[PDB]
Amino acid sequence: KAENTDANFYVCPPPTGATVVQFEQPRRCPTRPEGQNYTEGIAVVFKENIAPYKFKATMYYKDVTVSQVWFGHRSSQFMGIFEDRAPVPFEEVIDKINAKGVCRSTAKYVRNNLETTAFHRDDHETDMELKPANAATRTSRGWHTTDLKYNPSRVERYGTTVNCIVEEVDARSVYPYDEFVLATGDFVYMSPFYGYREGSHTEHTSYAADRFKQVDGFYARDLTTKARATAPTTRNLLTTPKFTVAWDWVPKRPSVCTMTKWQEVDEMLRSEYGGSFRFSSDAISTTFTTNLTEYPLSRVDLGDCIGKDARDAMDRIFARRYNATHIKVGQPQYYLANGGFLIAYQPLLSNTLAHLREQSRKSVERIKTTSSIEFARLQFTYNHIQRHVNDMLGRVAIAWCELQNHELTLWNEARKLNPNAIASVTVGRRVSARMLGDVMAVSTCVPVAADNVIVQNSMRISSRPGACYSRPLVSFRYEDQGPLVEGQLGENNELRLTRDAIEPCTVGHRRYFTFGGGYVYFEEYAYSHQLSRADITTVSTFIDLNITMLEDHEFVPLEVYTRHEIKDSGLLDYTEVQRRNQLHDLRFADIDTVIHA
Amino acid sequence: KAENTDANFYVCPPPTGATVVQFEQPRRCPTRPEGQNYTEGIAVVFKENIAPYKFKATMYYKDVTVSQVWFGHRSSQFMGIFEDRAPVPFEEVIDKINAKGVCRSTAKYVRNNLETTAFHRDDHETDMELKPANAATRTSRGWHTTDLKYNPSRVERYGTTVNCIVEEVDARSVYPYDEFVLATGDFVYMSPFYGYREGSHTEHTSYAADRFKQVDGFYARDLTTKARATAPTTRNLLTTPKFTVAWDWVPKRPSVCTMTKWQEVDEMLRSEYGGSFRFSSDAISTTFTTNLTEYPLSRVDLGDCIGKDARDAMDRIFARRYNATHIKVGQPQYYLANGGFLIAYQPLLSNTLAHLREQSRKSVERIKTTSSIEFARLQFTYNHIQRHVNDMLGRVAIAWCELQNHELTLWNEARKLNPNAIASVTVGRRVSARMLGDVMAVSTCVPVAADNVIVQNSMRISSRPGACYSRPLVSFRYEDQGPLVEGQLGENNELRLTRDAIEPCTVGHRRYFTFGGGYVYFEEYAYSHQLSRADITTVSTFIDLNITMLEDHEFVPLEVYTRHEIKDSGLLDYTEVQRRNQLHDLRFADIDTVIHA
Amino acid sequence: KAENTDANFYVCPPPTGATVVQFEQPRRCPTRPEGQNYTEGIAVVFKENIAPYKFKATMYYKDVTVSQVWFGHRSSQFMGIFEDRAPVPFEEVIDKINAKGVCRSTAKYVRNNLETTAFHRDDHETDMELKPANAATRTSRGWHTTDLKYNPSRVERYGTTVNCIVEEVDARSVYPYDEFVLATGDFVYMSPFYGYREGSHTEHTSYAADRFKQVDGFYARDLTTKARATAPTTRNLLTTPKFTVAWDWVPKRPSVCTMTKWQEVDEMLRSEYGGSFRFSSDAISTTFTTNLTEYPLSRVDLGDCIGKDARDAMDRIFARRYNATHIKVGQPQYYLANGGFLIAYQPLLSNTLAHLREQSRKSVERIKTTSSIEFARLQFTYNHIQRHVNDMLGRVAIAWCELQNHELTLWNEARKLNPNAIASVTVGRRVSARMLGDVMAVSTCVPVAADNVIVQNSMRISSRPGACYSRPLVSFRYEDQGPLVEGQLGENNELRLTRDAIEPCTVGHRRYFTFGGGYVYFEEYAYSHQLSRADITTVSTFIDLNITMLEDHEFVPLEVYTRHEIKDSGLLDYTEVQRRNQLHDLRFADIDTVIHA
Ligand SMILES: *[C@@H]1O[C@H](CO)[C@@H](O[C@@H]2O[C@H](CO)[C@@H](O)[C@H](O)[C@H]2NC(C)=O)[C@H](O)[C@H]1NC(C)=O
Numbered sequence A, B, C: 001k002a003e004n005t006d007a008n009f010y011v012c013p014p015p016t017g018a019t020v021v022q023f024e025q026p027r028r029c030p031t032r033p034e035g036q037n038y039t040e041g042i043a044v045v046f047k048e049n050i051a052p053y054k055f056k057a058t059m060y061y062k063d064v065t066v067s068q069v070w071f072g073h074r075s076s077q078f079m080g081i082f083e084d085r086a087p088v089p090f091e092e093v094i095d096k097i098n099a100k101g102v103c104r105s106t107a108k109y110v111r112n113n114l115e116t117t118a119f120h121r122d123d124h125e126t127d128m129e130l131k132p133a134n135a136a137t138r139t140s141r142g143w144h145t146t147d148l149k150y151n152p153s154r155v156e157r158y159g160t161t162v163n164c165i166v167e168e169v170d171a172r173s174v175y176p177y178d179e180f181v182l183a184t185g186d187f188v189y190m191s192p193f194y195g196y197r198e199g200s201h202t203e204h205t206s207y208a209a210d211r212f213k214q215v216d217g218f219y220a221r222d223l224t225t226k227a228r229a230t231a232p233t234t235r236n237l238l239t240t241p242k243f244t245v246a247w248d249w250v251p252k253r254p255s256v257c258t259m260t261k262w263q264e265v266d267e268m269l270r271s272e273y274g275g276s277f278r279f280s281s282d283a284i285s286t287t288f289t290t291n292l293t294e295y296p297l298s299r300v301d302l303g304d305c306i307g308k309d310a311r312d313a314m315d316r317i318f319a320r321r322y323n324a325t326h327i328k329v330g331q332p333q334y335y336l337a338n339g340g341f342l343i344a345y346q347p348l349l350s351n352t353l354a355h356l357r358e359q360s361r362k363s364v365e366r367i368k369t370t371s372s373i374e375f376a377r378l379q380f381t382y383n384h385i386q387r388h389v390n391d392m393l394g395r396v397a398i399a400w401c402e403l404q405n406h407e408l409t410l411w412n413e414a415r416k417l418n419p420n421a422i423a424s425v426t427v428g429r430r431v432s433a434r435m436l437g438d439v440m441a442v443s444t445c446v447p448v449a450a451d452n453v454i455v456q457n458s459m460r461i462s463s464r465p466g467a468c469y470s471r472p473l474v475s476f477r478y479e480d481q482g483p484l485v486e487g488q489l490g491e492n493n494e495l496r497l498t499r500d501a502i503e504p505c506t507v508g509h510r511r512y513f514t515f516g517g518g519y520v521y522f523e524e525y526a527y528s529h530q531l532s533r534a535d536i537t538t539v540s541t542f543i544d545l546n547i548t549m550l551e552d553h554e555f556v557p558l559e560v561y562t563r564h565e566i567k568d569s570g571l572l573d574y575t576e577v578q579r580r581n582q583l584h585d586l587r588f589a590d591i592d593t594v595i596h597a
């Protein structure tokens, strides 16, 4: 009896003609995409120039100090100090300071609608040469005359001081550059590019024309060294109510640029995909997307440095590598990418492939740029990855498809041998199978309880000596009480009624046979025992393939410096001060009490 | 003799019963995961409102200027100018400026604990109408009375000036909004929401109640246009020691919000995975993670705009697309993600699938947000990729497993034909193989030196004319001097002793046979020569599969603007100034010398 | 006739000896890389300390106020208020304020080169105790004496006020820490670490030595609480022209550090690849690249906290997990990664694997750090992904290669059965194939028009009763008028001339046969009809594999806060103010008009 019973039994007769089936034809294997045409080239990326136009100048003024003093016995107290900074008149700058490096001990200027005049020491005007300032770590240059305050003499009236001061400083002007400031925190409400030449008079000024002046062929005389006329300039000279500042007038457009060069890309591969271009600098790990057309520097505001810098850089680069390997291809091309980034691009071709497409590339505004260039480095990554995995996986499907094609060539010859099995496998269920011409006549098989099956001890034929069986005989019943059938066993638990599986008696006749969960054994055509597959050392026909799915992962908010670490980086907080300062009175004083008597 | 000897030889007899082996059964192929259920919906993302509460007001004050002058022959010098900014009294604002647009030529205010009174021109009080300020590019509005300083008349006392000034400015208050400032850099130590209505008196104030006032049904009269009563307001009026500022009192909570709307997401797919939710806006390329529960706006501080804005936006969006395709699903849902981001989410369902889960979603504090939203766009990416590669690779393993299943169906029939080979392959080593029942009796093969093997010139049988051999005869010896065996050759360098491979003599009898590194040839059962595989044009049975592993790549530190490019973007550096300014004295003066006589 | 004609026909004779071919040998399957050796360890990452050295001090000064008043009938006006802040002399700080908490009602100090003396109320010196300031929300502590300004008495001279003020404030010094400032916005041009001990005199000072002092064993007496001598200190005392500030002198190097601890990494796997190291904190999702050598803290400037903090942190961590599982491995190791990031790393080994490599790890400068740590989190990601996909795909190629190896074992036995087909498949074109020894004699097949082919109704043999054909007879012609050949049909549209495919007549003889686009049917060896494959329910032999390529995706510029949202976050804009302020005069005054008479 079927000891090992963790299986099902089947009985498969010759499958009646109907039904008949056919194998699926070879499938059309997919094709590798032609790929993606990339254009090798050099690129330069500009950015919204948030940097203020920087230049240098010179301040000329005098620190006037009028002091009143009250004299008492064995003591003295300041009664009211009046400090002011007054301009050094135009002529006093040209004829006095520049030429000789001197300055009047007197100050004459308009203040509060009147011609006030101050005399140092309250003594007749004496011209006094200038001397370098004192200890000044990390400070631009500066000179002056007076070094001591003047106070009234002993008694029981007033004293005026006049220190002609001149300082070299750093000036900072920002778009639209209609005005600028200094390192002293002093505003100057005139465009640094104001003047007369170049129609500079068009530029902005808040002052009367008589205040401003513009000296031509001006030879500055560097004090201290006393050196002079190193270079002639068109010295602009404005006279503020509090001082007189001057600087070398320079052209606007050439000196400024609303954009700043950010990156020099040696190889910026350019490709089209979806009505846009693709610039991927693998060197920097970045990818930009731009419309198909270019961008005229004409619509740009004061972006003169742009074209200038682009050319210089590119030509510079083309001379390091490409000058031998490749060759230029048309005039510079400019495209604008998302995030407000301007891309200067010059295509390249190696002699190996020795254009018209490059042609036909063609108020005022200004460009804004995103402080974050991550969306691009992201795109870059994704694409380079996606593109890869796709281009790769595709190759698989093809080979696979092709494999299944060749495999069929095998299934064809195979079905000839064991249709009953081959077909059963191709139908995913035990079925009777036989070849009816080129197609296959088939009819399902029938399940049989293993508990109802038992084998005969004899593989021999009492009625036919000399000859024996090739397969031991068996008996079974579908139902729990069903009739008993004299059918012989076939491969893989099939119950072949027709007992025509025979073979002449053989010497040294060992043989194992599939029998339920395990096998059955027979020595010399005589039964032996049943066993489990475990006993028989199993060998595999499969090519192993160990795979592991990519695990998850958490990306936590991570920052190098929180904005608060920045609001603190500022050594001085203008808000902290003014708050505490304008709160000073409230803390240490009462502003509501009135007194009288 | 075996000329081509870059190979090994084997002799395979009928493998003795022991040992016997079995093929590995079909393996259980993995199953596709049910997938990931995504919930379609609309979302809105708020952020820590770092923006200061912005509002407008009006300043009212007078620029008082007392000047002392010393008169000399042919000259005159200011002896001490005293400038001050004094408030314009309450009544003077309501009865004078508002109604008629005028202002007194006199200033009466408390300063340093006393009732000082200033008269413009030192002349009896005259009411003077106000006039718009002068040229003012990029400046809010402003008016005034006086336009010239008043100085003492010729001699050899003092002159007071009074310019009633009023300016429209921009006020800025920040959390907790207990106070605010102006564009003039003037602090006002009172909560902008202070007053009486709405229990505003609860709000913060550093001033006595008599200073502050709150006019009801106030009809402002726009100067210049002289238009008036366009709209009535509850004008708040505070009087600082230096001026009198006023503004329309407004409610707090409605006007402010500690959070600001950042992004309107049309489709924010929501899914659960690992006790958290998944909101992936594929449009923006971002993914947020939130706890399973919601977040009550109750724990929020003054976050009233939140719910308001969320509703407006969502309903707005639902009317563009979803209003036809989908339908709302319950009240708005709010979840908090990592990085301090608040997510407003409203689920959606198309009629095709026409909830309780949405239910059961349920001092004071404030939310902080990370300035970097990259950890999210990272997560988003990773997942969308990982999830893909996994979902894909899985499909492979399955198909593969299935392939190996079907493949077995072939290996079964195949072993019947060339067990000696099929098995040798399944054992990874040359072995003798024969079918013992359903299993396979096997016994390893034996290596034989090729240098010891030589073939016989004759494939014919001198003793048996008419008939010949199907395989030429050979001889060999295992050892270097071992006995010589009369065995015939079998397929693939097997040495079948039993010389029973025969065939009747055939006409036009060409035949090639595997012979060491190459082959051996025989014409008409008579030897010819040996050759190498090279000669025979080889054909492949393999389906090619060209693969390439993803190359490495370097991600270099890349920034659009270094923090230093920012510390410079600021036109004015409060630190640069105050340093140079407070260093001014050290550079151009001595503070250690004392004088007397 | 061939009704279904969407196919081609072929005639295949026994392929003449030439030409002959051979199958491709098994290919050498690739090997799994040994992998990547990772070193488990703990790490700590420092960063460019952009934070200013923070410490506390105390200001001591007096608010002197000299006021002149003009008296008139029924009125009075300030004629000129002179406000000044003067220092509280050294002795007055030690003997008066510290001990008793009092201060002189008089101020004696040098101003404008003279010994001015101020008396509160202009009355003989009286010592006045100090009292806490008034209402002060979010302000450090502060005390004072006077609380009211002093003004001249009724008439028709001057009044001086003296408010001894002392404030606790927050001091801020930045590299090189040669000077510092206060919360009052007051600069102090002396290195906070100046003094005498520790050779502090080396530090920077802009003042004469007599101004600065350094009290030893100083016991501060906390006012209000009047508590004293809680702790003795080396009180530094500098006396600026405007005040006298003091603070506890402390060592420099220990108190400061040009680097700040950023992240404590529990597990920072370290590995080598391409002459550099690999530190991947999977916890944070980050990867750093450093040279093979270390970095001496010797080249570091004032980076003392570094080693200190590194040790504390690490040892701390090693006591939470590793103390039991792993064991320390040598002294701390420091490497510098790109982006200016310093990595403190301590390797680890579990007892399971229980070093020399760790050894041999070995003016002044300072480190700069990138504000963006994304290039790293990028690298991290890419690698972890790339490495995965590679390590995975590889496994495929191998298994695949191996599969094709085993597959051959099948192709060998298969070709024996249907060479004509097997070979045709291996040649990618219909060819005649037969086994010539071990190789295969082959010769291409010939295409034949289907329109020229017709089958015979009889599968029977009139001349040979009892026996019949196994394959119906056919006729055809290559050319459009070519000769008619008596060849029988073979499998797959082959035209086997030799009509030797026979079989005895059979009962119930159904049979289908491939016939052009469809099939042909015969009942009892008598023709029936033709049909299309559609009729016959097709069954597949292929293992399906549904794949999908990863779709594209757009990464749009996305920012949490634009830099402009930051330029606004600042409650006060020093530029806005000074612009409007220094523009005040232009708006409400004329600076070009002169008057006289
Ligand atoms: C780059 O890819 C394009 C896109 O396919 C290729 O253009 C194809 O070229 C082949 C012939 O070489 C043909 O299919 C057509 O001429 C093109 N088809 C398409 C779809 O465009 C191109 O050949 C590739 N490489 C280069 C250098 O041109």
Ligand SMILES: *[C@@H]1O[C@H](CO)[C@@H](O[C@@H]2O[C@H](CO)[C@@H](O)[C@H](O)[C@H]2NC(C)=O)[C@H](O)[C@H]1NC(C)=O
Pocket: B034, B035, B036, B037
């Ligand atoms: C979404 O995925 C879940 C997770 O499997 C699915 O829920 C399963 O549904 C199937 C029957 O359709 C069964 O396995 C169980 O009902 C669920 N199993 C698990 C593991 O949850 C769900 O069907 C999927 N789709 C939808 C729209 O529900």
Ligand SMILES: *[C@@H]1O[C@H](CO)[C@@H](O[C@@H]2O[C@H](CO)[C@@H](O)[C@H](O)[C@H]2NC(C)=O)[C@H](O)[C@H]1NC(C)=O
Pocket: C034, C035, C036, C037
């Ligand atoms: C980590 O990977 C390296 C690199 O291969 C391994 O070193 C190899 O070890 C095997 C023997 O185990 C041999 O190929 C050589 O000794 C090494 N080859 C190379 C290329 O280096 C190492 O074994 C791996 N793991 C450990 C823990 O050592």
Ligand SMILES: *[C@@H]1O[C@H](CO)[C@@H](O)[C@H](O)[C@H]1NC(C)=O
Pocket: A291, A336, A337, A338
């Ligand atoms: C590019 O052109 C398209 C129209 O083709 C326009 O919609 C889009 O705004 C342009 N992009 C930029 C960056 O200006």
Ligand SMILES: *[C@@H]1O[C@H](CO)[C@@H](O)[C@H](O)[C@H]1NC(C)=O
Pocket: A319, A320, A321, A323, A324
């Ligand atoms: C082209 O390349 C070479 C590389 O050595 C470079 O030195 C040179 O400047 C370039 N061309 C010439 C001849 O200048």
Ligand SMILES: *[C@@H]1O[C@H](CO)[C@@H](O)[C@H](O)[C@H]1NC(C)=O
Pocket: B291, B336, B337, B338
């Ligand atoms: C979410 O809830 C968990 C507990 O379930 C808590 O540990 C965690 O802090 C919460 N996250 C946020 C963002 O508050």
Ligand SMILES: *[C@@H]1O[C@H](CO)[C@@H](O)[C@H](O)[C@H]1NC(C)=O
Pocket: B319, B320, B321, B323, B324
């Ligand atoms: C629904 O969608 C349509 C789209 O045309 C939109 O115009 C409409 O406002 C929505 N519903 C209605 C009827 O308002």
Ligand SMILES: *[C@@H]1O[C@H](CO)[C@@H](O)[C@H](O)[C@H]1NC(C)=O
Pocket: C291, C336, C337, C338
């Ligand atoms: C690391 O060392 C290499 C030379 O081996 C040098 O070129 C490079 O500048 C160094 N990197 C850093 C971060 O200093």
Ligand SMILES: *[C@@H]1O[C@H](CO)[C@@H](O)[C@H](O)[C@H]1NC(C)=O
Pocket: C319, C320, C321, C323, C324
């Ligand atoms: C080692 O690990 C344990 C974990 O419980 C920790 O508590 C302990 O501090 C460590 N070692 C010891 C004994 O302190």
